[PDB]
Each structure stands twice: as structure tokens, then as C-alpha cells.
Amino acid sequence: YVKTWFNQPGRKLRRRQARQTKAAKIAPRPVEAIRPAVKPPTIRYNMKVRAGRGFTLEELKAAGVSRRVASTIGIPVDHRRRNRSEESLQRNVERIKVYLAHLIVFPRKAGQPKKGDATDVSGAEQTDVAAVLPITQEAVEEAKPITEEAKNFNAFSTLSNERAYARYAGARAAFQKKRA
Amino acid sequence: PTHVSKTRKLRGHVWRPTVNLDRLWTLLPNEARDKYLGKNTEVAPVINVLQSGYGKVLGKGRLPETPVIVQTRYVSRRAEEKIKQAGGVVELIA
Amino acid sequence: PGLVVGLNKGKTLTKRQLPERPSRRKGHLSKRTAFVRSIVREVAGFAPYERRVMELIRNSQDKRARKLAKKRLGTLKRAKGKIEELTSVIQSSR
RNA sequence: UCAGUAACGGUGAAGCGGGAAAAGCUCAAAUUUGAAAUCUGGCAACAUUUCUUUUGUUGUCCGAGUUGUAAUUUCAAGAAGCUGCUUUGAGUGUAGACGAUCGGUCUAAGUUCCUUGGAACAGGACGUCAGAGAGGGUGAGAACCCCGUCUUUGGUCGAUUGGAUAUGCCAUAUAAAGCGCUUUCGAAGAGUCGAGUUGUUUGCAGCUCUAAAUGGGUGGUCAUCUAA
RNA sequence: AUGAAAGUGAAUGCAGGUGGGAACGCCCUGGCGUGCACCAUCGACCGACCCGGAAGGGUUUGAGU
RNA sequence: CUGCCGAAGGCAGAAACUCAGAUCAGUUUUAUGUGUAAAAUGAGAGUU
């Protein structure tokens, strides 16, 4: 059994046409939805930022948009993800805020901009999200002045201590519980 | 190419990557080296080997006397006071 | 300590208290289902091996009682879960 | 890609990472109890159609159904009060534009002269078209004889439609829904999980036995999921 | 890079010296410098092994700086 | 198809660099008893 790749240009052309057909069908709105900024879950990749599946309920509520209408206006919602730190919270919150600020909603039934809509909608144009919302990387630290207490601070001497504390943590954990 | 083979004449014949301090200044761009190396500035340049893809920094090479802050998870034993004798400090990143 | 190694190893950030997830709740004992479980209990009775445990406990041979209960169920935690329940029924009957 | 790595004794992954594509949901478990509000079928009209061939609407009768059909709820929650802001059609014709399917139909210029030859579609001379010098046929190598080819992501015919825009008519909201609070409760799947044993390549099956409700599963007291 | 593994994890001395050594230069054939690569030596450093409580001591070790 | 090199009962060739040598010899002399050592003749000899 062998799997040959003689249809690689054909697959590439078909995917491009499918993207083109998708764009033509839903032209008023961007062809890619808004995605949250999310950090990979490992020690090898926790220094980067990538695109998550969707926002969380806490982020949606903090931004002020309900989880019901969020799907309608094009904001994917993830019910599994949870925010364990405010740093991620206001990070995804400001992603939604800039999305909403740049967002224009065509009024339904074309009678009046009922509450949340756009008065002038003639400026419709299909633009990708990445241009308006360019996902970034972790902020690289710029040059800072020398810190004196850090200068006195050795470095890995500490990592040796808390390491030895960690390895023999059960050793003294026993010691206290047995003598108490 | 079959034509240049041997049978055409046989016819009928039957995770923790590491970096040494010699390469620490290489990580900073050319602009940072030009605007911080070899001169005396109150603010010191910072090197983040973690953002460059390095887990630990090891101790092979020398350094110019320009102070520099090294952000890393693990640091080598006498590489620390290699920074300190060079005038910089290793500030450990989490 | 904002450190890579230690009992509190890792980065230091502002921790947020997560909202309560409803699927974490399962296993709780509602008052209505507890009442209904009482009604079926008094209308159905107990299984044959339960009756043997009553006899064993009323004879006060608890070691054999827990041994046979573990043999019947399969796990010590289930055996203990039985024992406390049928002893709890015992003083109610008394 | 991890990776021919972990693992097993030659077999041989998966997590993470980068991409292609993205869309979420529905029940059982709670009383509508001031009202079975639900549904198939028979009969009679009204319709509508890719269609006299399709699909429905209303009225009436019988039946199903209280051993539970409707509405609300599915754990991301949710219900019950409380609150003051916001939102609303499972409709029916007319017109233009915007696409697409089917087939109908439209296309630029030598057959001029001399030699060879059965035949010129060959050679030479004099010319033309080209958004068309791809290909095929014609008595030998034909852009200009013919079909086609470019124009064509188009003009012209008709018949359909798919979605929107403008416009008209019906609907009935005495309602329904979203959001912030609780002085509230929060029902969640059993011969099923699980254990012992035998069999197959943890997973599955046979058999003995057989659960629980902050319980159960998974990973090294903690973390994460909520099966049958 | 080493270690069974946790792990640690490299120019002392021009990134160490000695001799040979290609080529080059200097004169005045040879001598002189000069020394690539490479080869003989050679000390240090990274470790695993041992002693010491990091310094220091081994003449053990790795197709190591 | 032609040419060149060419065995074996650890070989032949290829590449990388020594010394213009006393560097080797299916050899003969000289000395000590077929072994060893230090004149003849021939050859550019070699090392991983």
C-alpha cells in the first residue's frame, strides 16, 4: 500500500476555489472569525502566543456582549476554556473591544438601527481579521537599568536550595508529622 | 540516469537547548550591538535567551566589559560571576 | 517566588477565582432525591448479602464482615461505603 | 512534525507545535394541573408544485395518549422570585439587479499567378487576418477551403430556479426572549461502573459476583472530566 | 559533551607551550626568522571515579573544550 | 566495442603527506656463530 501525492497541485487549487466560493457566498463578513490570544500549555511553548478556538463566558461578559448574540455577530465561544489569570482576561477582553469598535452591524429588516446596529452601512467591504487584529507575540523586554539588589542576588544558588527543599520535601514532611 | 550506469557497459559480460556567553551578544540585533556595545550607558541591554529558544546558558567564552542583563531559567555556576565580573547581572525569568 | 524550581514553581501572575462549573457538582445529594432514596429503601428492603452483613454486624464479627463485603463488592472503598451505610441503618432500626 | 521516540519482545504510538476546515447542539431525570394545551388516520373544501405526477393548510369525525403527547430545562447551565433596559413573522404577490444549470444561436482573413504532380495541402512570387499561428478534415507539410480556435468570466433566445434589494398584502404581541441580582433550590442515564476468572488484538467479550451520590472516571491530597 | 540516573554540563597561561613542518620574508648554497594544515609531544578546562569539605590532590576515564 | 592496470592456492589498486635519503633488496661480499651486525650492485624510497 502506497500513498502518492500527484494530486497536490489539484488539492491546492480546489482549496483555493473553496475559499473563493466561501468568500463570494458570505462576502459582507470576513472569511475568518475572530480568534482569542492563547498561550500554549507546556514548558517548551509557554513563551509564545497563538490563536485559540474561541473566547470564554467570563471574557464575553466582561466585554459586555452576551454569549447568545456573540455567535450571531461572529464571535466564537469556548465553554471549556477558563481564565486563571487577569492578564489573559483583559488580554482577550481588549481583543473583543477592538473587534467591536471596528465592527459594523447591518440592521435587520432594513427599517431602523434598532439599538445595536450601524446608521451608515454603505461602506461595506470584506477585509480579513488579521489586518485589523494582528495577533502578536509575548512582549520582548527592552533595556532596563541595572538593579542593585538583583546584582547582589547570586542566581542558581537559590535554584539549588529550593531544589534541595523540593527533593527532600517529603523528608522533612515526615520529620514534622512524626515528631508532632 | 540509466544511460550512465554500469549495466550499459556490462552488456555482453553476463527540553533545554543551551547557549554559551560567547554567543549571547549574537542574539541581540545589529542595532542593539551598535548602540550598547563598547560604550558607557546608565541603562543596560537585556538578553532574553528564552525568547530566542534557549533554556540554559553555559560558560564557554569571554565577554566584553559592557554590562548586560541575562534573562534565563537556568544559569551556569561560574558563568554567573562571569557576568558579575563583566558588570552585568543575571535576572532569572520564570 | 516567581521561580522555575520549587514547591511553588512557575510564573507569578494575578490569580483569578474561577466561577463555579455546574458539572463539578455531580455527586451532590439533593434533598428530594435523598427523600426518594429513602422511600425506595423502605419499600424494597436489602439484598441477600446485606442481610448477611446485618447478621455479621449484630454478632459483632466486624473483621469477617468487612472481609466478605470486600469480596462481594471488589474494592475496599466500596466495602467501607457499604459498612457505614448499613451500620447507619442499624441504629435507625434499633 | 513529534519519530522510528516512548513502550513492548522486530513491533511501534500519543501529548505539545505548525497548518487544511470549522458549528454547535438535542433528550430522560422537576405538575400546564385554571383545564392534552400534543399527534397519525377518515371525510370536505382551500390551495401549492421541477409535477394535473409534488407538498401542505383549515374544518369535522374516529383514534393514539395521563403506564405521559405538547411548551420550559441539558450542568456551558438551569429553574423560582426580583429588576428595568433591549429585541421580535417558521408568512403571501409584483419589479429590477445579481449569480448559476440545461439546451437554442452568433463569429478574421487567397483558394490570385508560375513550375512539379493523378491530386498543391509542395516550391517561388504577390497579399491578408491574428484577443484567432491549438487541433482535425479535405486527392502530399493548409492560420487565410471547411469545422473549430480567440473574442467568451459574452451577445442573443427561451425554461428554470438559489439568495438578497425595492414594493404590496396578511399576522395578531393580553405574548415570547436576552441581560444584572438572589432571601431559593438545583432533579443529571444500573446487571451499568467496578472486581476475580477465561478468551481476542490498555480495548473488547463470556461467566461468578455486583456499587455509590461531592459520588464516579482519568493523570502524578492534588489537577482535570461528568460515562453507562 | 558526559553520566546507570538525578544531573552537571569546557580557551588558566597571545583560546597554553615544545619540536618537526607547507609557503613566505630577510639577507649574504646556507643561515635566519616565520609557521598553516597535520603529526608527534605538552598543560589547563568540561564532566563521570576517588579523597577532601568551593579551593586543593590524583597521572583513571570520554572517537570531550 | 576498444584501451590500460591486474591477482589470489592477509593480495592489487586509489587517495593524504613525509625524506633528495643510506631508504630498501627472494642478492652477493666482510665480521661474529642458516642467526645477527657493519662493503658491492640495483632501485627514488615510503608510511596511516
Side-chain angles (χ1 to χ4, degrees):
Chain A
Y1 306 141
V2 289
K3 175 207 186 298
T4 65
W5 284 57
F6 302 117
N7 55 359
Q8 174 181 168
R11 183 182 294 114
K12 168 184 193 59
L13 183 62
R14 183 193 324 127
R15 293 165 155 165
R16 167 199 307 292
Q17 297 169 337
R19 274 191 271 281
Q20 176 189 93
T21 303
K22 182 54 62 187
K25 194 212 301 303
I26 63 170
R29 54 201 80 61
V31 301
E32 311 256 10
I34 190 72
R35 295 298 176 176
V38 174
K39 300 195 74 70
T42 196
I43 196 66
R44 184 185 182 187
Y45 298 92
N46 47 2
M47 73 269 315
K48 292 168 186 173
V49 174
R50 62 162 171 87
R53 185 191 167 79
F55 297 92
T56 66
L57 317 175
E58 316 159 60
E59 302 164 1
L60 272 183
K61 181 163 64 182
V65 62
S66 67
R67 58 169 302 186
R68 296 294 88 193
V69 303
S71 67
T72 53
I73 39 184
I75 301 178
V77 188
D78 189 358
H79 64 91
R80 276 170 290 251
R81 196 168 70 81
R82 57 186 69 77
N83 280 187
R84 296 178 178 93
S85 83
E86 279 87 6
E87 305 301 326
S88 71
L89 182 52
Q90 292 85 12
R91 174 200 325 132
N92 291 306
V93 158
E94 68 195 6
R95 303 208 91 245
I96 272 154
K97 292 289 182 67
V98 178
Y99 186 62
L100 281 171
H102 274 266
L103 191 33
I104 54 174
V105 180
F106 291 87
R108 40 187 291 191
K109 85 174 290 295
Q112 189 274 331
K114 300 289 286 294
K115 185 202 61 43
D117 293 292
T119 51
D120 184 70
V121 296
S122 77
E125 194 260 333
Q126 172 150 91
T127 165
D128 81 65
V129 172
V132 188
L133 258 281
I135 201 171
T136 64
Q137 293 323 339
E138 170 175 353
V140 176
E141 180 60 31
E142 76 280 18
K144 65 177 73 175
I146 272 292
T147 314
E148 58 276 19
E149 64 266 21
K151 175 73 171 178
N152 297 116
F153 160 44
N154 169 265
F156 181 76
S157 53
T158 70
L159 326 175
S160 65
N161 315 356
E162 282 84 6
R163 194 193 174 133
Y165 190 14
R167 298 292 179 90
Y168 306 358
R172 56 203 67 85
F175 177 179
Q176 286 70 241
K177 60 173 177 276
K178 65 97 177 178
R179 82 174 192 268
Chain B
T2 64
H3 205 63
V4 292
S5 87
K6 253 189 78 160
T7 75
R8 312 308 323 177
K9 288 185 178 176
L10 264 153
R11 282 282 196 254
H13 301 93
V14 162
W15 175 81
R16 217 188 39 196
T18 61
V19 67
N20 300 317
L21 319 89
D22 49 15
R23 284 297 281 310
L24 266 288
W25 279 100
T26 309
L27 321 183
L28 310 210
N30 214 47
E31 146 46 61
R33 285 168 56 197
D34 291 28
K35 181 265 289 181
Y36 271 117
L37 190 31
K39 327 156 281 265
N40 321 339
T41 64
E42 293 183 343
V43 62
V46 54
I47 307 206
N48 203 0
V49 304
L50 182 83
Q51 269 283 17
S52 303
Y54 293 109
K56 189 162 182 183
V57 64
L58 305 195
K60 167 176 164 290
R62 26 198 320 155
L63 276 75
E65 291 306 91
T66 291
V68 58
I69 311 151
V70 178
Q71 296 195 304
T72 165
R73 290 176 189 169
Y74 313 151
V75 63
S76 173
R77 294 330 309 139
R78 74 281 191 191
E80 316 178 333
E81 69 274 16
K82 199 143 303 150
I83 318 294
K84 324 292 211 293
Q85 80 164 41
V89 58
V90 165
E91 172 275 349
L92 282 72
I93 188 54
Chain C
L3 198 64
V4 62
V5 184
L7 73 165
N8 327 72
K9 66 212 298 284
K11 268 208 65 173
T12 42
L13 299 58
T14 178
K15 297 184 183 69
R16 171 175 175 81
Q17 163 264 340
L18 326 161
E20 181 86 19
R21 303 176 54 79
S23 321
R24 305 287 219 179
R25 165 189 283 174
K26 181 174 285 179
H28 186 87
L29 181 46
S30 165
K31 62 179 190 296
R32 189 153 85 86
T33 185
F35 154 83
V36 164
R37 274 166 190 151
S38 67
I39 308 314
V40 49
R41 185 86 279 181
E42 51 206 290
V43 86
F46 299 90
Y49 81 61
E50 271 81 341
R51 318 320 290 300
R52 275 311 310 201
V53 176
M54 322 320 322
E55 284 335 321
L56 257 283
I57 295 301
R58 287 190 176 97
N59 164 286
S60 296
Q61 163 54 290
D62 168 303
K63 173 78 173 179
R64 171 186 162 186
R66 59 179 175 271
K67 180 66 170 64
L68 61 84
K70 186 170 189 295
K71 162 69 168 194
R72 290 285 89 188
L73 279 291
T75 325
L76 70 69
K77 64 91 176 179
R78 284 166 182 206
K80 264 75 174 175
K82 298 288 94 176
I83 298 321
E84 329 325 333
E85 281 196 359
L86 298 75
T87 86
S88 63
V89 176
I90 274 278
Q91 73 263 9
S92 67
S93 88
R94 296 294 86 193

